[PDB]
């Protein structure tokens, strides 16, 4: 559920910047234009690990596939970090440092 609910609860604050605009010749989102207009010296466009398309992408399954993958990996990460937190809660007293 934690993996699945990430995108639906972020959409209300995200969709407004996903409206389409037409620049000189290209099509842009409002988010891309916000990033372009307000200049970051050390943030070129090529750095962002965003999706760019694949020949194995299918009929509008991107967000659900990402959500399910995130949930499945979150299962294992939760299982590991529960015991990590249990270890960090140790009351063991050692004798020599």
């Amino acid at each position: 559920g934690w993996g699945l609910l990430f995108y639906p609860n972020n959409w209300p604050a995200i969709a407004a910047f996903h409206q389409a605009t037409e620049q000189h010749g290209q099509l842009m989102t409002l988010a891309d234009l916000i990033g372009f207009h307000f200049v970051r010296t050390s943030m070129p466009e090529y750095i962002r690990m965003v999706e760019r398309g694949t020949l194995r992408t299918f009929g509008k399954d991107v967000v659900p596939v990402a959500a399910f993958f995130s949930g499945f990996v979150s299962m294992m990460v939760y299982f590991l970090w529960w015991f990590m937190g249990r270890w960090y809660s140790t009351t063991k007293v050692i004798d020599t440092i």
Binding site: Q19, H37, T41
Partner: protein
């Protein structure tokens, strides 16, 4: 600011910046100015720096003191990464709208991929006005106009802050109802079942149901408000169009070819004497008028009688000295070029002796009696002369 700290040989042998202009040195808020220029890619591109196959044109300002409305490189509007080919010239232009009042040093730069950033000439721009008067009007596909400075922030707050308040209320409710020391003591004595009962589980279930309902309602209302949205647009652009005007490096029958036979630079002096074999494949005698560096200009005072409009910290109007004999057409001549300016030391081009490759690079410009300019690429190893 920041280029001086970069190695001299990497600055000289990656990108040679030439004619660079700032349309306005003083702008108001909401006033536009254009920073244009040209760049040459050095043929002997360093192995340390990655290929310019993936690169991004950028404005080197201390922040969004100017808003970039558009930028063009290689005859193409370039909001994303482009490709620069080795040994070719590309013209660039950037439109900037004044946002924050003050004096700022704004540079031309190109961020190549895992090699990194290359910084060009900069100029001081004075922006006068109030940042509160700044507007960033943007037209959508439906014809509606928004202010990019202020658009969409209220929605972000109205979605984010109430959920933080809800989480704080959840934590506070459980903390006040149960406590920490009391709950710890109850759990420690085997009475952990006394902390949580049926009513607590019912309250949690009701809270989760309300949270899920709120999430679904918010998603549906958001989709109703914005029925048509598109994903983020990303990707490398199509190959660029290089400069093909007469006089640039790599053009037709009339040109100049310069080869570096040898050079010596003083350590820690300000001088650099080089030997240049020049072949003149034009129809008119030429005089060497300029040597181009990482963004520095060393001009021949016999050719550049009046200094041009360039930033003072990069303009050496008397930095280049050669013989006063023009190179006749079709004549191969060996000449001795002396570069002498304090700007060679201030810009830390004299730190070549600290690098792992003691080489120079740049562009040489030759001029005709009628003022036609021919560019050639010079580069190669140099020898440090240690002096005390």
């Amino acid at each position: 600011h920041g280029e001086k700290s970069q190695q001299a040989f990497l600055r000289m042998r990656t990108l040679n910046w030439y004619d660079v202009q700032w349309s306005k040195t003083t702008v108001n808020v909401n006033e536009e100015m254009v920073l244009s220029g040209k760049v040459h890619v050095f043929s002997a591109w360093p192995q340390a720096v990655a290929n310019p196959r993936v690169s991004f044109l950028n404005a080197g300002e201390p922040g969004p003191v100017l808003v970039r409305t558009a930028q063009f490189i290689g005859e193409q509007f370039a909001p994303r990464s482009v490709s620069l080919e080795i040994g070719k010239d590309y013209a660039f232009s950037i439109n900037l709208r004044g946002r924050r009042a003050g004096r700022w040093h704004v540079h031309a730069q190109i961020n190549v991929e895992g090699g990194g950033p290359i910084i060009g000439p900069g100029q001081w721009i004075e922006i006068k006005g109030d940042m509160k008067d700044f507007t960033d009007p943007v037209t959508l596909l439906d014809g509606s106009t928004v202010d990019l400075e202020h658009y969409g922030i209220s929605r972000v707050y109205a979605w984010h802050l109430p959920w933080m308040a809800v989480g704080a209320a959840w934590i506070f409710f459980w903390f006040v109802r149960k406590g920490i020391i009391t709950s710890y003591i109850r759990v420690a004595e085997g009475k952990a079942d006394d902390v949580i009962g049926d009513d607590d589980r019912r309250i949690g279930a009701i809270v989760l149901a309300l949270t899920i309902l709120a999430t679904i309602v918010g998603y549906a209302v958001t989709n109703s408000t914005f029925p048509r949205t598109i994903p983020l647009q990303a990707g490398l652009q199509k190959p660029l169009t290089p400069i093909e005007t007469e006089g640039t490096v790599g053009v037709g029958k009339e040109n100049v070819t310069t080869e570096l036979n040898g050079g010596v630079y003083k350590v820690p002096g300000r001088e650099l004497t080089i030997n240049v074999k020049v072949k003149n494949n034009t129809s008119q005698p030429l005089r060497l008028g300029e040597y181009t560096a990482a963004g520095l200009r060393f001009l021949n005072p016999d050719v550049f009688t009046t200094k041009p409009d360039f930033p003072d910290y990069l303009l050496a109007d008397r930095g280049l000295s050669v013989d006063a004999t023009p190179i006749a057409p079709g004549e191969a001549k060996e000449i001795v070029v002396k570069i002498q300016d304090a700007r060679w030391d201030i810009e830390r081009l004299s730190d070549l002796a600290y690098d792992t490759d003691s080489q120079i690079g740049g562009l040489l410009f030759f001029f005709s009696p009628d003022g036609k300019r021919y560019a050639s690429e010079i580069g190669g190893p140099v020898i440090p002369k240690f002096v005390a």
